[PDB]
Scaffold this active site. Structure first.
Site, PDB file in Angstrom:
ATOM      1  N   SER C 141       1.743 -26.190  11.051  1.00  0.00           N
ATOM      2  CA  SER C 141       0.705 -27.143  10.672  1.00  0.00           C
ATOM      3  C   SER C 141       0.215 -27.918  11.883  1.00  0.00           C
ATOM      4  O   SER C 141       0.995 -28.186  12.805  1.00  0.00           O
ATOM      5  CB  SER C 141       1.214 -28.155   9.635  1.00  0.00           C
ATOM      6  N   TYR C 154       6.935 -34.212   5.835  1.00  0.00           N
ATOM      7  CA  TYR C 154       6.223 -32.972   6.111  1.00  0.00           C
ATOM      8  C   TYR C 154       6.135 -32.706   7.614  1.00  0.00           C
ATOM      9  O   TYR C 154       6.429 -31.596   8.071  1.00  0.00           O
ATOM     10  CB  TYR C 154       4.827 -33.042   5.507  1.00  0.00           C
ATOM     11  N   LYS C 158       7.621 -29.521   9.895  1.00  0.00           N
ATOM     12  CA  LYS C 158       6.770 -28.595  10.634  1.00  0.00           C
ATOM     13  C   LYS C 158       7.070 -28.617  12.143  1.00  0.00           C
ATOM     14  O   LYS C 158       6.997 -27.573  12.805  1.00  0.00           O
ATOM     15  CB  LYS C 158       5.295 -28.909  10.341  1.00  0.00           C
TER      16      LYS C 158
END
Lengths: 247, 251, 260, 253
Positions: C141, C154, C158
């Site tokens: 990401s 998150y 990543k």
């Protein structure tokens, strides 16, 4: 003539009963701070308290347990009225080295639980009390492995990259509240291979090197330092010396 | 059982050259290094300003006229320093210029890019070369550069400026690799600081960059407390270069 | 045409989103494609649409049994594994503070995004190392490149995937195996507990307004195209690469340009 | 099949090496290609071989008048400029110490590598900003990603290029223009260079493969094509992972 670079500061140091943690406890204490040692080695922790005296206390804390973390932060603020420094230093390694073919799901989860989840929990609860103060410093012990491959196992390396990324993201959110967030990323000696293959010849990483980087970052000397990954590795993570070695 | 702090002379015994030392960050670092017990050679082209620092600070601080883009000037700066003090511990390649505060690539004059490069990149190159000349036989030394936060993020400096400071970061890391074999550390300090707008749009609220912040980063890197720090780009920008706040601000 | 002729690929999260785009694209380029997901109706629909070269396996990427079966069944079907695309990923929230992030949310996100990537790479390496060939891909990401874009849970996961991808590139390069990841802009997540479609739309709408590259909008096809380049023999010497697909968002802090 | 159909590309350093490989590859995918170089004979031989969709312009990239002439004639030939591939670069040495780096050598490497890319992006931007479209590419180097691979002068110049690429990506994205670079592993006298290339192929991270010029052309083709319509600011490293690892510990085991 001497100076106290952390006079009046209140600091929590996880993994503080040994290694880099204990070095940072001693050094922060020498510089006038009140230090809460958070660890799971109560004999070692209480011994440091007996050696250094009143400005240092010990609290049993499994950093992967949010209740422990909550108690750690809340009793510190209750004791001293404020929290200046959260140093999420606690870490573990799954192995010295090994292949992805041989890593077990359960070991990866254990390394993630202590290294990433613990630092995540520690930052969450420090931010909880730091945001109303409109000031504070959140630190992590990451690793040179977050800057270069080939230094640690896949689980450890992944966990330390995550810490550096969490560090940058928290510096972004918490800057609006005047809170600084950084990390220190040491090479080894948490010596034989490390000193030989290291980039800086004639030098050896000692625990004090990491403590001193943490001291700089935690002090008002670092008043505009946030988001920094302060690497302490003699330059190991900036070079692939395969060519130099073969020239 | 009684806390004893850090000694106030963290650079006691050290000999340091600071280019661009007569004003700004350099002058701040000259004063701080002097307060920490260092012998300090101010290298600049503002002679009256540099000598006034020396007159204020006394015998441990001297002044040398040096255009850092001129290799004869750099060679003389290093050689006079070694002749005066017997060694060189810290080479602080701090001198830097800008073509503009901001501007489009379409407007950018070739001659401006070249002048920015001559001072910022070629000058830092020369300073490191001649520091290394005397530093390798000592098997010790610390070579520093003032780079810039714009070497870590776009949108902060002009193209010429930003390119020259990326080059300095790359040079720092390449030099950390070569000179580490000789025990020499190489690092840079990358400050944030049009100045009124930089302070309003910074990531760290409740604080503003002051030149002492940069001096303090340089002090840390120059000190023996940083004896295992090499290859480090020490950014001093309150987090500005780690974030694109476009979407935070759109929430 | 047919940049993946005769190649066998597994795509986790393949029943929707970027994964489904990559499934179609790889299939047009001649690959055999095994879809791994937990949306069975969506995946079988794609299989029914594309024919024999595309197959579906129900797979919870956090479950090692599932990953072990997905790899071994694929090998039993086609005799080899060329591409392992660990694309499955979830968010906890489109945005949100560290103060109200739950431990369970972080653990859930780690379980799918990081542990699932780990497990996929482990079992792909098990069959690729004897081959002395293979390509392992991750969907990371753009938030692994800049702060301010994803939540803390998150973003951490990543970053962890980018680190794993580089560390695997170093281990598996000795066996001829390439490891890379694709890092898109936007909001990228499968179905997940408490992921509002309104909130995602509101953030996806803001991200298209504040993107760096004007006049263009990121599409799932853009990310599939990056995975296809990375998986193809045209990338024979590309490993350890974080192929960012974000129009330049992660290289700039535009606060000065905006304020000027 | 043709992944650059209708596109017009300028490729500096296009008469040999990575440039010539990219010239051939872009032409094969439907592009009009203007070769820009100072090897007039080699460059014209490529044009004669490939036909009238490929042309040659003598251009020293460190000279602004050459760069302006290059862009303007290209736009005059074809009415637009889609791709500005600033590929030309030189090394000062295969490897050497900071102690023996010559100021003049450093300035010459900066002149071609950095100033040339600067000038080429300047004049390409001059024409693509009104188009509200374009792709500006640089050939950087894997040594902008890791130390120990290039000389100091070369490495500094390629770091500068990576930073220019990102700063341009920020300025020009508002006009729909993408800016990226490709960063190859290889070193790219001739024997001096071949010796280092041979050593690089022995110490590479990715075993069972060797970098070829076609690998770099393929990365440029991807970035130049509409397959990369949302790719900007990217440093596309082509090095089999060499720059992400320090294998010193692995090797001592």
């Amino acid at each position: 003539s001497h100076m106290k670079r952390l006079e009046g500061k209140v600091a929590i140091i996880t993994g503080g009963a040994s290694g880099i943690g204990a070095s940072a406890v001693r050094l922060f204490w020498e510089n006038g701070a009140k230090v809460v040692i958070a660890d799971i080695q109560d004999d070692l922790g209480q011994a440091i308290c007996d050696k250094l005296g009143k400005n240092v206390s010990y609290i049993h804390c499994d950093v992967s347990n949010e209740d422990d973390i909550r108690n750690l932060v809340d009793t510190t603020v209750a004791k001293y009225g404020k929290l200046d420094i959260m140093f999420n230093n606690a870490g573990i390694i799954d192995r010295p080295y090994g292949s992805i073919l041989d890593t077990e799901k359960s070991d990866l989860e254990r390394v993630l639980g202590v290294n990433l989840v613990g630092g995540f929990l520690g930052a969450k609860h420090a931010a909880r009390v730091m945001v109303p103060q409109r000031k504070g410093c959140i630190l992590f012990t990451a690793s040179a492995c977050a800057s270069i491959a080939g230094l640690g196992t896949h689980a450890y390396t992944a966990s330390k990259h995550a810490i550096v990324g969490l560090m940058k993201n928290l510096a972004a959110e918490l800057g609006q509240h005047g809170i600084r967030v950084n990390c220190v990323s040491p090479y080894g000696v948490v010596e034989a291979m490390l000193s030989e293959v290291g980039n800086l010849k004639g030098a050896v990483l000692k625990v004090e090197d990491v403590a001193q980087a943490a001291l700089y970052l935690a002090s008002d000397e670092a008043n505009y330092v946030s988001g920094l990954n302060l690497v302490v590795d003699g330059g190991f993570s900036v070079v692939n010396p395969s060519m130099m070695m073969a020239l």
